[PDB]
Amino acid sequence: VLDRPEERITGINDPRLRNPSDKFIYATVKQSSVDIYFRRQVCLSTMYRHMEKHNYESAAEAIQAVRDNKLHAFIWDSAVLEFEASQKCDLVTTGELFFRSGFGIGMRKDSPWKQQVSLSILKSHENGFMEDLDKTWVRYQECDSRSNAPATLTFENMAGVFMLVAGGIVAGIFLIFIEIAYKRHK
Amino acid sequence: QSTLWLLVGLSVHVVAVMLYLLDRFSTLSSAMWFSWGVLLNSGIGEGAPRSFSARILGMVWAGFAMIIVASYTANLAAFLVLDRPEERITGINDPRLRNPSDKFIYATVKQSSVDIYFRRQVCLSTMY
Amino acid sequence: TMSDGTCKEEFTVNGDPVKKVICTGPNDTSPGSPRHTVPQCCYGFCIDLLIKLARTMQFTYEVHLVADGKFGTQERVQNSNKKEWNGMMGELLSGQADMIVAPLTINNERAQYIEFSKPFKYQGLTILVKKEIPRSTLDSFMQPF
Amino acid sequence: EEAPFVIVESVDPLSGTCMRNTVPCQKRIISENKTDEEPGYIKKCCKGFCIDILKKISKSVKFTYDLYLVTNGKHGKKINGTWNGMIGEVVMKRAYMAVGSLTINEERSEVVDFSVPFIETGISVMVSRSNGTVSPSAFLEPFSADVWVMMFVMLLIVSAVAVFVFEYFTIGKAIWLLWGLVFNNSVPVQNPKGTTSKIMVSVWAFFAVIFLASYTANLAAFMIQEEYVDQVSGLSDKKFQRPNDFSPPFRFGTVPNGSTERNIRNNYAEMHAYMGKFNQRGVDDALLSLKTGKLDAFIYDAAVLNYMAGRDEGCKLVTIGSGKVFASTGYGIAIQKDSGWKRQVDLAILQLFGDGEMEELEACWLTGICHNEKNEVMSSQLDIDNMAGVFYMLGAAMALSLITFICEHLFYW
Amino acid sequence: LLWGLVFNNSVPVQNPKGTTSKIMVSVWAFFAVIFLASYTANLAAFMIQ
Numbered sequence: 008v009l010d011r012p013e014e015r016i017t018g019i020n021d022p023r024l025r026n027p028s029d030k031f032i033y034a035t036v037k038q039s040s041v042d043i044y045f046r047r048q049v050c051l052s053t054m055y056r057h058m059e060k061h062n063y064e065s066a067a068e069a070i071q072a073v074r075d076n077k078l079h080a081f082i083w084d085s086a087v088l089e090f091e092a093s094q095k096c097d098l099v100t101t102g103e104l105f106f107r108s109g110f111g112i113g114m115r116k117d118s119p120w121k122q123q124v125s126l127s128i129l130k131s132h133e134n135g136f137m138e139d140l141d142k143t144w145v146r147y148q149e150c151d152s153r154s155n156a157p158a159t160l161t162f163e164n165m166a167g168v169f170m171l172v173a174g175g176i177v178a179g180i181f182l183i184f185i186e187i188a189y190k191r192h193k
Numbered sequence: 194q195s196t197l198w199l200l201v202g203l204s205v206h207v208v209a210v211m212l213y214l215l216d217r218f219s220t221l222s223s224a225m226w227f228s229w230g231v232l233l234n235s236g237i238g239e240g241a242p243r244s245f246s247a248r249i250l251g252m253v254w255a256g257f258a259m260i261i262v263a264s265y266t267a268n269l270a271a272f273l274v275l276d277r278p279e280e281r282i283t284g285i286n287d288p289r290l291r292n293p294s295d296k297f298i299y300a301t302v303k304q305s306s307v308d309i310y311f312r313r314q315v316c317l318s319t320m321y
Numbered sequence: 322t323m324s325d326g327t328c329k330e331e332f333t334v335n336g337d338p339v340k341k342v343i344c345t346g347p348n349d350t351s352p353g354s355p356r357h358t359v360p361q362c363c364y365g366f367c368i369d370l371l372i373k374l375a376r377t378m379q380f381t382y383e384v385h386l387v388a389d390g391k392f393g394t395q396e397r398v399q400n401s402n403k404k405e406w407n408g409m410m411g412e413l414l415s416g417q418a419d420m421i422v423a424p425l426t427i428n429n430e431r432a433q434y435i436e437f438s439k440p441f442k443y444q445g446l447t448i449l450v451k452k453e454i455p456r457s458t459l460d461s462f463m464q465p466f
Numbered sequence: 467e468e469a470p471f472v473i474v475e476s477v478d479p480l481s482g483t484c485m486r487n488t489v490p491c492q493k494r495i496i497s498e499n500k501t502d503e504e505p506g507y508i509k510k511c512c513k514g515f516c517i518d519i520l521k522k523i524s525k526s527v528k529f530t531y532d533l534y535l536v537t538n539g540k541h542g543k544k545i546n547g548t549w550n551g552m553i554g555e556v557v558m559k560r561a562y563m564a565v566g567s568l569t570i571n572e573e574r575s576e577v578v579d580f581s582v583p584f585i586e587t588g589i590s591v592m593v594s595r596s597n598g599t600v601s602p603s604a605f606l607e608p609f610s611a612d613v614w615v616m617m618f619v620m621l622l623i624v625s626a627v628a629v630f631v632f633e634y635f636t637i638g639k640a641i642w643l644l645w646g647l648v649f650n651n652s653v654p655v656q657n658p659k660g661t662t663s664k665i666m667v668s669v670w671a672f673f674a675v676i677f678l679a680s681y682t683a684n685l686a687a688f689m690i691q692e693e694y695v696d697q698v699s700g701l702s703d704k705k706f707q708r709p710n711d712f713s714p715p716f717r718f719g720t721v722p723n724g725s726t727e728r729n730i731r732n733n734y735a736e737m738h739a740y741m742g743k744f745n746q747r748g749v750d751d752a753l754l755s756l757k758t759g760k761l762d763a764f765i766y767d768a769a770v771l772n773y774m775a776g777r778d779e780g781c782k783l784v785t786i787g788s789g790k791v792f793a794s795t796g797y798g799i800a801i802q803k804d805s806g807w808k809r810q811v812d813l814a815i816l817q818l819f820g821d822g823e824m825e826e827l828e829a830c831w832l833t834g835i836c837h838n839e840k841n842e843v844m845s846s847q848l849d850i851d852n853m854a855g856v857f858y859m860l861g862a863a864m865a866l867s868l869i870t871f872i873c874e875h876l877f878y879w
Numbered sequence: 880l881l882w883g884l885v886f887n888n889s890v891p892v893q894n895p896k897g898t899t900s901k902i903m904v905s906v907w908a909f910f911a912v913i914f915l916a917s918y919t920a921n922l923a924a925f926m927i928q
């Protein structure tokens with residue numbers, strides 16, 4: 008139990024996310040919505056500076072840099088990142104959702120297609136259409152993996168004592184040789 | 194659960210008599226003493242079954258009983274931690290202090306300062 | 322795309338025909354390139370939704386990726402005073418587009434100049450970090466010794 | 467009046483007008499005798515989630531407002547092309563806005579406007595409590611299979627060579643002593659040849675005790691486990707789809723003439739027809755009839771069901787979880803059509819989302835005891851499947867003993 | 880023999896009188912293994928400090 012890693016990272020309340028040290032880096036995508044949210048936040052300014060120092064250009068690059076242990080933690084959207092984690096695999100999400108908002112089609116002001124598209128989107132939410140899209144190729148197509156467990160026994164664990172096996176055996180060969188030689192002498 | 198308890202009491206005897214009849218085909222009672230002891234890791238010894246493979250199977254069943262006692266000590270080490278009381282009460286944020294149930298009672302002194310503080314508090318009215 | 326001009330079709334797990342569309346745009350290389358406005362081919366959740374929507378509303382269209390990969394935010398450019406909408410938001414607000422179908426967030430900063438539909442997928446924000454297995458076997462006979 | 471989104475109260479037996487952080491909400495009872503009239507004007511005062519929302523909006527964009535409860539119909543449905551309930555009160559010009567627990571769909575949007583949704587919600591399924599079982603099947607996890615047989619063959623070969631060099635016997639001797647080392651059991655210890663071989667088995671016992679300490683610790687570690695399941699997987703599940711098999715999971719609650727009602731009716735007609743036998747008295751009757759055994763499956767707005775599951779004594783439950791939400795839409799603030807207020811109200815609610823203030827409202831309006839602390843008492847040797855598999859391995863060993871005895875009888879003669 | 884039961888060590892096991900006394904030490908070993916499981920678990924518990 009003692010040799011358990013620092014395996015605890017929560018949402019935006021943990022002091023670590025507030026007093027940044029160069030052991031960790033938290034990055035995002037430049038010019039992104041997350042940048043707006045963090046900028047117009049009163050008492051996260053230190054975090055915002057330290058983050059602005061190391062942001063990226065695209066989501067995929069950051070995913071890769073996290074896979075290569077250059078970037079320690081990533082703060083991005085929830086759907087994209089959840090799929091990317093559960094699917095690729097051996098990456099995990101920690102913490103609870105905080106900036107709960109939605110996605111949406113965009114339009115310049117005053118196009119009648121706005122009034123039409125809103126009704127269309129609702130109709131589509133009703134027919135389960137969106138649901139079957141999601142089930143089709145958003146989720147349920149991943150490295151669906153369970154939770155963690157303590158470590159097991161491996162060969163590197165046994166090597167330290169297998170040496171005493173062969174070492175004792177060669178010592179015993181030499182020892183029986185010399186003991187029989189001595190019993191032949193006296 | 195009396196089931197994992199009672200199953201071995203019959204399995205030991207049936208496998209012992211099985212190997213005993215095997216040796217008879219080419220010691221019975223001594224084989225029973227032996228199987229009970231080797232399950233219990235007794236300081237009581239006797240002779241092994243005559244053939245090689247019969248005592249081979251005996252030693253396999255011995256490894257099985259070893260896994261049994263390992264499971265038992267593991268389960269006791271578990272029950273150590275599992276039977277821990279609800280020993281966690283924090284300041285005024287825990288939901289329990291917010292959704293009161295008649296299992297707990299939180300009291301103060303009437304006309305006291307604490308009563309003022311809790312009264313002029315917006316979303317602790319149920320608690321109050 | 323394949324050399325035939327399109328990109329070859331395929332099939333889902335159920336053998337269903339994956340819809341695809343021809344989408345021009347980037348230089349095929351954003352970091353280092355003059356520009357190569359080359360035809361690509363797109364397909365995605367949003368693409369499916371766009372297809373259904375259009376069939377429901379009698380559109381006709383052509384998709385093109387954004388010029389510089391950035392979602393969009395406000396900025397005051399250098400050597401001027403006019404603060405400008407960056408990236409894709411700008412490509413909409415300038416006149417280069419009539420709609421923006423993508424994973425776009427919703428917040429009042431954008432909602433000043435744009436009109437939003439109802440949300441079509443709720444979500445939030447969260448953090449990703451690498452998962453590590455390693456055990457701690459080290460001179461097992463010696464560490465407690 | 468509804469679940470924590472809006473609450474009503476008697477005013478104040480101490481002060482004549484009620485406490486701080488509350489809004490006076492009037493009620494017009496019209497249910498007295500029909501003799502002359504009485505518009506029952508009682509001043510009560512209301513408080514809750516949506517009340518706080520509008521209390522902040524009004525200060526942000528400078529309304530003033532009375533507050534006006536409603537009588538004819540709970541929420542609202544179409545009736546001969548007419549609307550009752552809150553929507554009815556809106557279309558009849560008696561109110562610009564309606565607040566509180568109100569959904570969003572297509573049919574309402576056809577006649578009234580809608581602000582931007584400020585809480586996502588949808589359909590869900592609540593059932594009785596669930597229980598778990600034993601997750602592990604065999605206790606081989608404390609080592610890799612490769613570890614296991616690698617050690618196996620290494621030990622066997624070293625034993626054989628130690629015998630072959632000590633003679634310079636009785637294979638059973640070496641085998642049984644090795645197995646006694648690994649199992650710490652009493653063994654028929656023959657052939658104790660007094661030589662260096664004794665030092666060899668001393669080192670053997672060294673290795674064996676180290677390995678057994680490692681194994682017991684590893685099993686103590688791997689003993690940590692948990693389990694849970696729910697025996698329904700969506701509105702598309704066969705039970706709901708085919709509610710006429712042998713199993714009658716029955717009496718789906720679905721308080722009538724709300725929203726989920728009409729959604730179900732427009733999608734699953736036979737489910738509606740068979741669902742004609744249901745629960746009709748709000749949410750309290752639902753929870754009761756679920757507790758007794760009068761029914762097993764409830765269907766209502768997730769936004770109140772997850773809360774009810776949270777602040778509940780004991781622990782009942784909903785279907786698998788959030789990932790099971792059907793036709794996800796959100797609550798809103800329905801304002802009259804084409805009013806100029808719409809853009810400003812929308813922008814103000816977005817402003818609230820921005821500065822992280824919905825956190826406070828979720829913090830002290832929406833929390834539960836059992837909506838946390840996911841764990842279970844670990845499984846002792848109650849695993850009948852694990853032990854049954856081990857016993858099946860034992861019986862296979864018995865059969866192998868039979869067959870090798872037959873083969874030895876054949877090889878002798 | 881009693882100390883070997885409590886300690887599970889190799890002992891110079893003399894006098895194995897074959898009678899009911901053998902059933903007696905069988906129950907002895909039952910108690911001993913239960914007690915040793917209890918002791919190892921208890922030490923695992925008290926190790927937290």
Ligand SMILES: *[C@@H]1O[C@H](CO)[C@@H](O[C@H]2O[C@H](CO)[C@@H](O)[C@H](O)[C@H]2NC(C)=O)[C@H](O)[C@H]1NC(C)=O
Pocket residue numbers: 539540721722723
């Ligand atoms: C659902 O529809 C029924 C159908 O009208 C509504 O109510 C009924 O109950 C009222 C009060 O007892 C009566 O005044 C109505 O005459 C009666 N209607 C019929 C056809 O019997 C009911 O209020 C609606 N809402 C709910 C939640 O049930």
Ligand SMILES: *[C@@H]1O[C@H](CO)[C@@H](O)[C@H](O)[C@H]1NC(C)=O
Pocket residue numbers: 544545546547
């Ligand atoms: C319409 O009105 C008739 C009586 O005029 C009534 O019987 C019927 O139930 C009503 N139906 C609807 C859908 O309003």
